[PDB]
Amino acid sequence: SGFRKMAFPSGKVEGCMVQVTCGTTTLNGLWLDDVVYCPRHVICTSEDMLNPNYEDLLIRKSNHNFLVQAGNVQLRVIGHSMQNCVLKLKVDTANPKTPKYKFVRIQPGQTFSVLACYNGSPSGVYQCAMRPNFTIKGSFLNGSCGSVGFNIDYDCVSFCYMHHMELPTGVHAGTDLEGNFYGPFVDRQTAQAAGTDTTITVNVLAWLYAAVINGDRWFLNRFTTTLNDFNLVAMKYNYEPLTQDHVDILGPLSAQTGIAVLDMCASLKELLQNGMNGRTILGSALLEDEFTPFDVVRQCSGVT
Amino acid sequence: SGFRKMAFPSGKVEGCMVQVTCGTTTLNGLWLDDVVYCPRHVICTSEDMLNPNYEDLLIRKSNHNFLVQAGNVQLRVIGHSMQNCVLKLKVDTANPKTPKYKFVRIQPGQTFSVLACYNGSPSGVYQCAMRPNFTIKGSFLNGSCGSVGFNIDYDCVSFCYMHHMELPTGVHAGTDLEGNFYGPFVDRQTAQAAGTDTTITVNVLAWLYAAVINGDRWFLNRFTTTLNDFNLVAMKYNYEPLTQDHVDILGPLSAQTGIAVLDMCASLKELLQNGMNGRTILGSALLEDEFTPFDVVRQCSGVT
Ligand SMILES: O=C(NCCc1ccncc1)NC1CCCCC1
Ligand SMILES: O=C(NCCc1ccncc1)NC1CCCCC1
């Protein structure tokens, strides 16, 4: 009972965090096997950062200009390469704490945990979603670059995010672990505007099911709707369209609560049209969209 | 930039979690040095649970009736004792992953991280506060008993909470690591009502400072107030009274923002009197009270 914004336990990722120094820039790296992953902008002098040519800047850099410190022990760099916007530093020592892992590129609406780090050391963990405009609304200060986002499935860490950038609007931009930015952003100190931050409709539905499972039912109404009618309303309210793929993924929550997905859609529709009237659902005065259907099933069934 | 509900990294506590079985009841234990801490109700048959005499039930229990499994390796129990509502199982092996630690009893309004565990295995981490009625609003299913709440200061884990009980209202009750319940609750299957869940005023103020630091300023007004006038309003709105001790602890946030504590009090007063008018602060449509002043300073200054 109770429904909390919950992060994956951070221990497996804590054991991968190192400090990368190049010149006067220190940020965080991810040490997996004998490779340290970090943002390539580690090589920039924030005067470079205005219009960097990373290939050209990298010519001036050797293995020994990359300082990699794990705990307070130095790793020997025996190779370096650039993959998109990340540097891969080959070290002479495989991380003895390497978990089973994958690199996954997630879709907008997918949630993950961030281990916020400074100087290769963890400060905190929180739950995030990839916004539909491919930003995340994180908590990141100077020195946090290289901090990673991840999901855990039993023993396997899926790394989905590395932190690169703060947009001038104070939202956050970064890469998958192959160094490809989510969204159109570039690792450059240039004004870059984010698109519309729409609500992740499928996630709101999942969280309305979590609320029903936990006893919060006041918002359940006598209406149903169709996919097309609901989507007209979603559009008007800057909600992502709902697809049959979203309806399918919600099946187990529909199943447990006996509330048809389109019925829950008609309940959400009325919440958009009438607002909450000063009421709360699961202790929130607005509709939470950073729980996936998978996250609700996980938390509601006690998965480890 | 950005302000997130943030938990301490969970790795140091993950390495302490074990599974305790007694009879047919399995829950979680905390293994620190050569001692495993768990809720004493592990020895109850939920028929015992109606009116248990723990001393009497413990007479029927030997070292070998307590099954303690760490990973999938069994610990040999060489002693057991009861301290208030917890059992202390002496094992023959000191936990090699024991962090530096303390047991602390926290006050209502203090925040901590919970590592929710099932069968000695972590499922997730979230941030909590000890409510002023000495409940916490957690996320806990059957098998979660023994899950702990904690704070970290650099390398030292302060354990403040062990999970014992779900009240019939779906809020949560438990002990410090000396086995003393927060609040008046007893480890018994008997209807136990929680008192008024008032808002932690000092924490709301800290989070209003965090909002100002992060650019959310719309709620700042032209008024100030006094401690006595503010407290009249707090009382009317089921907010905890504000003391000079709360004002003192807020000093650094006052200092950075140049907003006198009593000025921020007058801003909160107007938010209580006028509500948010459909506006948000730090992405919330209500006033968050699960950030302490210490938590705001920590997150806003990047402490590891
Ligand atoms: O340097 C910065 N932001 C750029 C650094 C950064 C990088 C990735 N994520 C978040 C932040 N802010 C400073 C802090 C102190 C006050 C004046 C602005
Ligand atoms: O057994 C229970 N609660 C008691 C167990 C418990 C203990 C500590 N925290 C939280 C929960 N609920 C069951 C679950 C399945 C549906 C019917 C009620």
Curated annotation (Swiss-Prot), chains A, B:
Subcellular location: Host cytoplasm; Host Golgi apparatus; Host nucleus
Intervals, Cytoplasmic compartment: 1-304
Included range, full protein: 3264 to 3567 of 7096
Regulation: Inhibited by pyridone-containing alpha-ketoamides compounds 13a and 13b. In turn, alpha-ketoamide 13b (tert-butyl (1-((S)-1-(((S)-4-(benzylamino)-3,4-dioxo-1-((S)-2-oxopyrrolidin-3-yl)butan-2-yl)amino)-3-cyclopropyl-1-oxopropan-2-yl)-2-oxo-1,2-dihydropyridin-3-yl)carbamate) inhibits SARS-CoV-2 replication in human lung cells. Inhibited ex vivo by michael acceptor inhibitor N3. Inhibited ex vivo by compound 11a and 11b.
Domain of life: Viruses
Recorded catalytic activity of this chain's protein: TSAVLQ-|-SGFRK-NH2 and SGVTFQ-|-GKFKK the two peptides corresponding to the two self-cleavage sites of the SARS 3C-like proteinase are the two most reactive peptide substrates. The enzyme exhibits a strong preference for substrates containing Gln at P1 position and Leu at P2 position
Quaternary context: 3CL-PRO exists as monomer and homodimer. Only the homodimer shows catalytic activity. Interacts with host FBXO22; this interaction promotes the proteasomal degradation of nsp5.
UniProt effect for mutating N142A: Does not affect ability to cleave and inactivate human TRMT1
Consequence of substituting M49A: Does not affect ability to cleave and inactivate human TRMT1
Source organism per UniProt: Severe acute respiratory syndrome coronavirus 2 (2019-nCoV)
Positions annotated as active site in the UniProt record: H41, C145
Cross-link type Glycyl lysine isopeptide (Lys-Gly) (interchain with G-Cter in ubiquitin), residue numbers: K5, K90
Record annotation: effect of changing K90R: In strain: Beta/B.1.351
Primary role: Cleaves the C-terminus of replicase polyprotein at 11 sites. Recognizes substrates containing the core sequence [ILMVF]-Q-|-[SGACN]. Cleaves and inactivates human TRMT1, preventing tRNA guanine(26)-dimethylation of tRNAs. May cleave human NLRP1 in lung epithelial cells, thereby activating the NLRP1 inflammasome pathway. May cleave human GSDMD, triggering alternative GSDME-mediated epithelial cell death upon activation of the NLRP1 inflammasome, which may enhance the release interleukins 1B, 6, 16 and 18. Also able to bind an ADP-ribose-1''-phosphate (ADRP).
Protein name, entry field: 3C-like proteinase nsp5
Peptidase C30 domain residues: 1-304
